[PDB]
Scaffold this motif. Structure first.
Motif, PDB file in Angstrom:
ATOM      1  N   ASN A  19       0.818  -1.212   0.000  1.00  0.00           N
ATOM      2  CA  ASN A  19       0.000   0.000   0.000  1.00  0.00           C
ATOM      3  C   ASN A  19       0.852   1.263   0.000  1.00  0.00           C
ATOM      4  N   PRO A  20       0.637   2.164  -0.958  1.00  0.00           N
ATOM      5  CA  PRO A  20       1.185   3.520  -0.817  1.00  0.00           C
ATOM      6  C   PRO A  20       0.546   4.307   0.313  1.00  0.00           C
ATOM      7  N   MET A  21      -0.755   4.132   0.531  1.00  0.00           N
ATOM      8  CA  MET A  21      -1.557   5.082   1.291  1.00  0.00           C
ATOM      9  C   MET A  21      -1.354   4.907   2.796  1.00  0.00           C
ATOM     10  N   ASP A  22      -2.095   5.703   3.574  1.00  0.00           N
ATOM     11  CA  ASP A  22      -2.191   5.484   5.013  1.00  0.00           C
ATOM     12  C   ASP A  22      -2.963   4.212   5.323  1.00  0.00           C
ATOM     13  N   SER A  23      -3.988   3.914   4.530  1.00  0.00           N
ATOM     14  CA  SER A  23      -4.882   2.799   4.783  1.00  0.00           C
ATOM     15  C   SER A  23      -4.859   1.864   3.585  1.00  0.00           C
ATOM     16  N   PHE A  24      -5.342   0.648   3.809  1.00  0.00           N
ATOM     17  CA  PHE A  24      -5.059  -0.474   2.931  1.00  0.00           C
ATOM     18  C   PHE A  24      -6.136  -0.685   1.887  1.00  0.00           C
ATOM     19  N   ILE A  25      -7.098   0.231   1.800  1.00  0.00           N
ATOM     20  CA  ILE A  25      -8.289   0.062   0.960  1.00  0.00           C
ATOM     21  C   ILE A  25      -7.916   0.036  -0.522  1.00  0.00           C
ATOM     22  N   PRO A  26      -8.283  -1.001  -1.245  1.00  0.00           N
ATOM     23  CA  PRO A  26      -8.351  -0.922  -2.704  1.00  0.00           C
ATOM     24  C   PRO A  26      -9.720  -0.443  -3.141  1.00  0.00           C
ATOM     25  N   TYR A  27      -9.938  -0.383  -4.445  1.00  0.00           N
ATOM     26  CA  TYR A  27     -11.285  -0.472  -4.975  1.00  0.00           C
ATOM     27  C   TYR A  27     -11.426  -1.852  -5.597  1.00  0.00           C
ATOM     28  N   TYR A  28     -12.656  -2.347  -5.664  1.00  0.00           N
ATOM     29  CA  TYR A  28     -12.897  -3.725  -6.050  1.00  0.00           C
ATOM     30  C   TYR A  28     -13.648  -3.756  -7.369  1.00  0.00           C
ATOM     31  N   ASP A  29     -13.240  -4.674  -8.238  1.00  0.00           N
ATOM     32  CA  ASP A  29     -13.676  -4.661  -9.622  1.00  0.00           C
ATOM     33  C   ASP A  29     -13.778  -6.093 -10.112  1.00  0.00           C
ATOM     34  N   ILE A  30     -14.617  -6.286 -11.130  1.00  0.00           N
ATOM     35  CA  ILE A  30     -14.675  -7.568 -11.816  1.00  0.00           C
ATOM     36  C   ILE A  30     -13.361  -7.784 -12.551  1.00  0.00           C
ATOM     37  N   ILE A  31     -12.854  -9.010 -12.496  1.00  0.00           N
ATOM     38  CA  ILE A  31     -11.596  -9.356 -13.132  1.00  0.00           C
ATOM     39  C   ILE A  31     -11.846 -10.616 -13.947  1.00  0.00           C
ATOM     40  N   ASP A  32     -11.021 -10.807 -14.981  1.00  0.00           N
ATOM     41  CA  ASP A  32     -11.058 -12.046 -15.747  1.00  0.00           C
ATOM     42  C   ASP A  32     -10.758 -13.242 -14.851  1.00  0.00           C
ATOM     43  N   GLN A  33     -11.674 -14.202 -14.837  1.00  0.00           N
ATOM     44  CA  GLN A  33     -11.550 -15.306 -13.910  1.00  0.00           C
ATOM     45  C   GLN A  33     -11.582 -16.677 -14.554  1.00  0.00           C
ATOM     46  N   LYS A  34     -12.035 -16.804 -15.806  1.00  0.00           N
ATOM     47  CA  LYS A  34     -12.113 -18.110 -16.464  1.00  0.00           C
ATOM     48  C   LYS A  34     -10.727 -18.687 -16.712  1.00  0.00           C
ATOM     49  N   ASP A  35      -9.770 -17.828 -17.028  1.00  0.00           N
ATOM     50  CA  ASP A  35      -8.369 -18.202 -16.906  1.00  0.00           C
ATOM     51  C   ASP A  35      -7.927 -18.315 -15.445  1.00  0.00           C
ATOM     52  N   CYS A  36      -8.375 -17.398 -14.583  1.00  0.00           N
ATOM     53  CA  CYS A  36      -7.747 -17.210 -13.277  1.00  0.00           C
ATOM     54  C   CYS A  36      -8.371 -17.989 -12.119  1.00  0.00           C
ATOM     55  N   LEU A  37      -9.415 -18.793 -12.318  1.00  0.00           N
ATOM     56  CA  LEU A  37     -10.102 -19.379 -11.166  1.00  0.00           C
ATOM     57  C   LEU A  37      -9.312 -20.601 -10.708  1.00  0.00           C
ATOM     58  N   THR A  38      -8.759 -20.532  -9.494  1.00  0.00           N
ATOM     59  CA  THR A  38      -7.986 -21.655  -8.970  1.00  0.00           C
ATOM     60  C   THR A  38      -8.872 -22.863  -8.698  1.00  0.00           C
ATOM     61  N   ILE A  39     -10.058 -22.637  -8.133  1.00  0.00           N
ATOM     62  CA  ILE A  39     -10.983 -23.697  -7.745  1.00  0.00           C
ATOM     63  C   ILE A  39     -12.327 -23.385  -8.385  1.00  0.00           C
ATOM     64  N   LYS A  40     -12.792 -24.257  -9.277  1.00  0.00           N
ATOM     65  CA  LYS A  40     -13.991 -23.916 -10.024  1.00  0.00           C
ATOM     66  C   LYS A  40     -15.258 -24.337  -9.282  1.00  0.00           C
ATOM     67  N   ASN A  41     -16.394 -24.071  -9.921  1.00  0.00           N
ATOM     68  CA  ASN A  41     -17.705 -24.227  -9.309  1.00  0.00           C
ATOM     69  C   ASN A  41     -18.124 -25.688  -9.294  1.00  0.00           C
ATOM     70  N   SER A  42     -18.740 -26.106  -8.181  1.00  0.00           N
ATOM     71  CA  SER A  42     -19.280 -27.458  -8.077  1.00  0.00           C
ATOM     72  C   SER A  42     -20.360 -27.707  -9.121  1.00  0.00           C
ATOM     73  N   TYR A  43     -21.254 -26.746  -9.308  1.00  0.00           N
ATOM     74  CA  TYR A  43     -22.087 -26.671 -10.501  1.00  0.00           C
ATOM     75  C   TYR A  43     -21.560 -25.538 -11.369  1.00  0.00           C
ATOM     76  N   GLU A  44     -20.937 -25.896 -12.487  1.00  0.00           N
ATOM     77  CA  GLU A  44     -20.486 -24.911 -13.460  1.00  0.00           C
ATOM     78  C   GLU A  44     -21.681 -24.202 -14.080  1.00  0.00           C
ATOM     79  N   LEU A  45     -21.562 -22.882 -14.229  1.00  0.00           N
ATOM     80  CA  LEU A  45     -22.657 -22.070 -14.741  1.00  0.00           C
ATOM     81  C   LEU A  45     -22.944 -22.388 -16.204  1.00  0.00           C
ATOM     82  N   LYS A  46     -24.222 -22.327 -16.555  1.00  0.00           N
ATOM     83  CA  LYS A  46     -24.693 -22.626 -17.897  1.00  0.00           C
ATOM     84  C   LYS A  46     -25.322 -21.377 -18.498  1.00  0.00           C
ATOM     85  N   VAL A  47     -24.989 -21.095 -19.758  1.00  0.00           N
ATOM     86  CA  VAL A  47     -25.649 -20.005 -20.468  1.00  0.00           C
ATOM     87  C   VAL A  47     -27.115 -20.341 -20.705  1.00  0.00           C
ATOM     88  N   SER A  48     -27.396 -21.606 -21.034  1.00  0.00           N
ATOM     89  CA  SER A  48     -28.729 -22.169 -21.308  1.00  0.00           C
ATOM     90  C   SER A  48     -29.527 -21.397 -22.360  1.00  0.00           C
TER      91      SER A  48
END
Lengths: 8, 205, 118, 163
Positions: free
Chosen positions: C89-118
């Protein structure tokens, strides 16, 4: 001499 | 446009009130970190609620955004109670604005909020890295280095006024006075998003 | 010798100053969390004039998971196994901002039920 | 002279009126701060509504700007007891072909805004037990300077040594 006296 | 000066209003709200927080011109216990003062903030900015004071701050920002092409540089001036001499002069810019062009493209909401979050966090960084001695007895005043303005004569010339929008506009030209016109200057990382070029620096004494 | 990560951390630290919390590292490299701990240790090991230090989470748990703010102290984690270093952290406090990130490459542990477009 | 006389005379008359209100030579609620503006400014401009006293200060500023051409260092001291040093020395330093009317008219705002920045930011020693006296040259004094008049042809150093 005297100043701000005539402009007193 | 319409959305772009909303972003400018939020950015100046964050900039101004964060300078107010880190100079301890208001007590820190009144401040709390937040995202909502009338809009969506990019970062958690410490904001005291104090509705006279936040009325003053959004007043000043709606004053500065009212001209929006004369201003090439908004700034914040720091004056002690002890002397009128400038303690810090925080630099901001309204250069190469989208609004003067009135270009519809491009919105890039997450990208402009990203570069705003960067410039805010830089403001945090170079506001803790100067020390805290004589933490009270500091005040606040605005200054605008602008390229081509004079509006203050619009009160004069026997004008007859009828609408609230130009009542506001006469308040805008009434509130601003030209002053009469270095020791240290420090760098700040500005936002470098495309339509909103805000090249922001700092000055010391 | 993975300095390919380190310069990417260097822009986000320096050329703009938004902190990395975790997710920029997993987005950039898709390395393991143990390997991310090694990478952040390497950045800490090869620190040259950090503006301010990070604080770690602690791997030693004892039914506790606490971000360390008593940095000198050992807050109920005395027989410590390890620490996972993150939140530089540069700042006094540790706060990031939180955002959607690419996860289909990045998901270490996937879903027990994988999502379906259907 | 040379076209700074009108805005200089209204600037000193309004400066005297603001000193009269905010350092309460007269009673503070003995004024009208409501219906007069001096220049295009937000703040209140509290002139004494007394016709004989507004004529008195009218002749005062009119005669000091009559003697403007060789005038010496200007000041106003508020006196009830022994102080014997100048309180508010708005020094009128005579300069001298610059055409500056609009810019000097804007400049007298910032002079008067430095005045009110000295006025609202000013402590309170005693109510109504003081009297002003214009003069051309409270335990302990204090030094304070205010803005200059570089845009104006004549420079005004605008020192205010309070107490």
């Amino acid at each position: 001499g005297k100043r701000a006296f005539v402009y007193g | 446009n319409r959305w772009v000066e909303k972003w400018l209003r939020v950015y100046l709200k964050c900039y101004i009130n964060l300078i107010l927080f880190y100079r301890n011109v208001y007590p820190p216990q009144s401040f709390d970190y937040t995202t909502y003062q009338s809009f969506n903030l990019p970062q958690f900015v410490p904001i005291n609620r104090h509705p006279a004071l936040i009325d003053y701050i959004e007043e000043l920002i709606l004053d500065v955004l009212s001209k929006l092409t004369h201003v090439y540089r908004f700034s914040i001036c720091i004056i002690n109670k002890k002397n009128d001499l400038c303690i810090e002069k925080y630099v901001l810019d309204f250069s190469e604005l989208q609004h003067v062009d009135k270009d519809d493209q491009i919105i890039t909401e997450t990208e402009v909020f990203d570069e705003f979050r960067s410039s805010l966090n830089s403001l945090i960084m170079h506001l803790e890295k100067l020390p805290k001695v004589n933490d009270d007895t500091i005040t606040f005043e605005a200054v605008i280095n602008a390229i081509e303005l004079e509006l203050g004569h619009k009160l004069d010339r026997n004008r007859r006024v009828d609408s609230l929008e130009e009542k506001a506009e006469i308040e805008r030209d009434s509130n601003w006075v030209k002053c009469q016109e270095k020791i240290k200057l420090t760098s700040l990382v500005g936002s470098d998003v495309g339509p909103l070029i805000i090249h922001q620096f700092s000055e010391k004494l | 010798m993975d300095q390919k990560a380190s310069y990417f951390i260097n822009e986000k630290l320096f050329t703009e100053v938004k902190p990395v919390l975790f997710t920029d590292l997993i987005h950039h490299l898709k390395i393991g969390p143990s390997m991310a701990k090694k990478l952040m240790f390497d950045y800490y090991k090869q620190t040259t004039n950090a503006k301010y230090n990070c604080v770690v989470i602690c791997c030693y748990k004892d039914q506790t998971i606490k971000i360390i703010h008593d940095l000198s102290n050992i807050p109920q984690q005395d027989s410590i196994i390890d620490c996972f270093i993150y939140a530089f952290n540069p700042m006094d406090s540790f706060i990031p901002y939180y955002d959607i990130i690419d996860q289909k490459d990045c998901l270490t542990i996937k879903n027990s039920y994988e999502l379906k477009v259907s």
